Each structure stands twice: as structure tokens, then as C-alpha cells.
């Protein structure tokens, strides 16, 4: 179709499908969460919605499953047990470190068909469409 956002879902689904084959137990939302926890340990669970793209509900179920698999650990505010702080466990660290090159490689199967200038320009368009 000639619809930009239809072709967008085409590209996004192909990337997701390749991601699923390569990382069957770590989806892109789960991977992004873990990336965001690594470069900000103790990040607030609420601040992790922007840093990972999600809703409060989806992040809650995600973090529960990751907590259930020993990938992350969480601590609460003593004054407001609603707010939570999230860290990556040593097991989660190992999972994340191994997944980064695989994710980069899945990105590269698509980004690699673009020049560095084209990749940068794709990024400025996507950012201009958001802000």
C-alpha cells in the first residue's frame, strides 16, 4: 500500500519476527527495559515507562515475569510502597550482555541496507513526526 504507516507496520513486524527467532525469550520491550535499568540502576518503575515505551499495566506484568525469572529485583519506597526501584540482577546482567550483540545484529539486517546518512535521516524524520 501507499500508506506510510501501513508500510511502517510492515517493517516493524518483520523486525519483530526476526527478533523473535533470534531472541525467543527476550522481546524488544523486555530488552529495552533491561537496557534502561542497566544505565540507570535503581530507576523508578514509573520512570521506566518512557525509557521503555509501555503502559503502567504492561510494564507491571513485564517486570513481574522478569522478577519471576530472577532477571531483575525491585525495592519499594518505605513511605509509599506503590513506588518501586528496579535493579538488574547478576543473572539479568548476563542475559542483557549476551542479548545486545544479537539485537544489534537484528537491527543491522535492516539498517545495513541504508547508508549512515540514510540511517541518520530516517532518525530525524521519525523524531520530527513525534515532536
Binding site for a second copy (CB under 8 A): 1-15, 28-29, 32, 35, 53, 107, 110-111, 113-114, 118-119, 121-123, 125-131
Instruction: Tell me the closest approach of the beta carbon of residue 131 to a second copy, in angstroms.
Output: 8
102: alpha, beta or left, given left = phi > 0 and alpha = psi -120 to 50? alpha
Pick the closer one to a second copy by CB: 94 or 110: 110
Pick the closer one to a second copy by CB: 47 or 83: 47
Pick the closer one to a second copy by CB: 77 or 120: 120
CB 1, CB 7: distance < 8 Å: yes
Q: Which residues contact 67 (CB under 8 A, 6 or more apart)?
A: 73, 74
Instruction: Tell me the closest approach of the beta carbon of residue 13 to a second copy, in angstroms.
Output: 5
Count of positions (residues) in the chain: 131
Amino acid at each position: 500500500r501507499n500508506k506510510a504507516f501501513h508500510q511502517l507496520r510492515q517493517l516493524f513486524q518483520q523486525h519483530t519476527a526476526r527478533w523473535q527467532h533470534e531472541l525467543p525469550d527476550l522481546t524488544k520491550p523486555q530488552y529495552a527495559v533491561m537496557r534502561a535499568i542497566a544505565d540507570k540502576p535503581g530507576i523508578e518503575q514509573v520512570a521506566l515507562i518512557e525509557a521503555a515505551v509501555s503502559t503502567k499495566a504492561t510494564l507491571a506484568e513485564m517486570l513481574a515475569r522478569m522478577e519471576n525469572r530472577g532477571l531483575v529485583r525491585r525495592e519499594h519506597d518505605a513511605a509509599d510502597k506503590r513506588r518501586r526501584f528496579v535493579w538488574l540482577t547478576a543473572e539479568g546482567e548476563k542475559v542483557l550482555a549476551a542479548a545486545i550483540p544479537i539485537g544489534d545484529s537484528v537491527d543491522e539486517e535492516f539498517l545495513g541496507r541504508l547508508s549512515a546518512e540514510e540511517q541518520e535521516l530516517f532518525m530525524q524524520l521519525v523524531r520530527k513526526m513525534m515532536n
